[PDB]
């Protein structure tokens, strides 16, 4: 199996799972630990943001690759926004200070 871009989850806005759904591989906790041990910060950021759930970031990355500029503009994962909305729904004020 192999996937570059395809369907995405309805809620988490993440690539689906399985060959039947043309889905992508899971970069689990152990993989994140291995990348952190290597010191590979940029590869980890690529997997987290512009490959999984940064809706604007992944589209910008696709356009940039098509036009030759292999650069990314990382954003905020949609999963963190879902977590924020859930915690606010539990009657707890969680907010990002600036």
């Amino acid at each position: 199996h192999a996937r570059s871009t395809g369907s995405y989850s309805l809620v988490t806005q993440q690539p689906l799972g399985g060959k039947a759904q043309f889905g992508g591989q899971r970069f689990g906790e152990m993989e994140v630990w291995a990348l952190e041990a290597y010191g590979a910060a940029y590869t980890l950021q690529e997997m987290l943001t512009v490959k999984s759930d940064d809706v604007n970031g992944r589209t910008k990355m696709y356009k940039n690759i098509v036009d030759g500029n292999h650069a990314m503009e990382p954003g905020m994962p949609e999963s963190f926004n879902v977590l924020l909305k859930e915690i606010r729904s539990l009657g707890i004020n969680i907010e990002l200070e600036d």
Binding site: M76, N81, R88, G91, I92, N93, I94, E95, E97, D98
Partner: protein
Amino acid sequence: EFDAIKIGLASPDMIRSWSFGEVKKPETINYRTFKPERDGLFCARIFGPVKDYECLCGKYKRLKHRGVICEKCGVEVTQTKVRRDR
């Protein structure tokens, strides 16, 4: 963009500040038109339009009317992704 995450109790005024409206009915969608019901759990007047730059009426159905609230329904003409934030 942000340097810290602050947690704490939520005041009723803060909860009202978050909210874009009050859900008054347990209705979700019509059983025939499959459209959101007013003042329900899926209301387009509170949470946003179901189609991009459209209103439930269909009167405002293009981008020139962005940010305009339809008088017949009250649905703001904007993107559907606001239904993930509102």
